């Protein structure tokens, strides 16, 4: 357990799917967000990242949003909770595209996400 492959959901209802993990820790997959900053139609978006291949692995990944000019990165660690269920504790940075360097200071949001298996 704490295999990162497969499907996960966060408390927002977003879906993270990790398709494969390589021996050097590299992984690829897709992200489907339940929420967004604008009203454009949300589309499945690709991700790439890395995990440690340790007990309780740390990891990070980037999502290249297919429907906006934003990028989000997450980093976190996997643990088993009290019930022995896998949980990914993460923090994220959401970069929005600014028109000019003078507005750069406005361009980065932060938050936490908690991912668990689909019940």
């Amino acid at each position: 357990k704490c295999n990162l492959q497969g499907q996960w959901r966060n408390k927002l209802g977003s879906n993270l799917i990790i398709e494969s993990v390589s021996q050097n820790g590299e992984f690829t997959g897709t992200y489907f967000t339940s929420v967004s900053l604008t009203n454009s139609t949300i589309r499945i978006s690709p991700l790439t990242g890395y995990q440690k291949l340790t007990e309780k692995p740390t990891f990070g990944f980037t999502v290249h949003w297919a429907f906006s000019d934003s990028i989000t990165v997450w980093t976190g660690q996997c643990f088993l909770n009290e019930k022995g269920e896998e949980i990914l504790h993460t923090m994220w940075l959401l970069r929005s595209s600014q028109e000019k360097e003078q507005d750069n200071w406005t361009g980065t949001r932060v938050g936490a996400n908690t991912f668990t298996r689909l019940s």
Copy 2:
């Protein structure tokens, strides 16, 4: 120049960021050589993977898979041309350190800014 991220970059800490040819979909890989680290372990060159947007003044994000520790760092940011026409990467980062227990998770994520320019 028009913020194609390919090439050598340096931040104010003196870390070296090297980005390879950006793929048609914006995906890139590269290497990171940090000038600073959390402990006394010898710093080794580390791989990175990420994406950039394909628009003017691109947003981007990437993950560095540290070769010498159990940590992971992610950056996200946006490239602008400064006042001198010179390119500049404005970034924020999250550094995840590996914790031994789920109860210590709250301690595991550092945050900062980095500013990268061409050498």
Copy 3:
């Protein structure tokens, strides 16, 4: 509801007490953390901050830890959940004291906290 006065707890088990709120939004109180970075004895610590006096108020405060050289700031907003119970959604920055400016980059942690009334 969303009066900030009185006692609150977060998921770590920490206790936030807001003693009074003034007409200009200023508030004072104490914080008792259930967790810390070191092994020194945790002691009740003072806080000062401000809230908006609006529906669903935003707020921020600083805790002057009495038992370490750290400082933490929180900012967030109060809402009523589905049950009609008050909830404070917050993000925090924990600054630890560094010995030298060269290590400044290591000195700031980030996370989320969720505060509710004692049940």
Copy 4:
């Protein structure tokens, strides 16, 4: 100088930070005049309250209660003497914007760094 925070400070955005006499317990108040804001509303001088540590190279934190918007910003950081003996405040900040609904909470917190020096 020894990082007593009393006085006038400026950051790279050009915002003005003014801190009054620090009390015996480290508490301070002051005023903040930002050079930049999220919307087109006219910027007004805004009050702040916070604390500094009483040790060499003090950590500190404060909250600004914006007089012209429903937002709140908190900063935390540490004062060092740079290489030129000149004092410098290294900070990170969280800017909370007021959301209309609990469901939009994830959008409500921006993050950045600020660097303050004496005028």
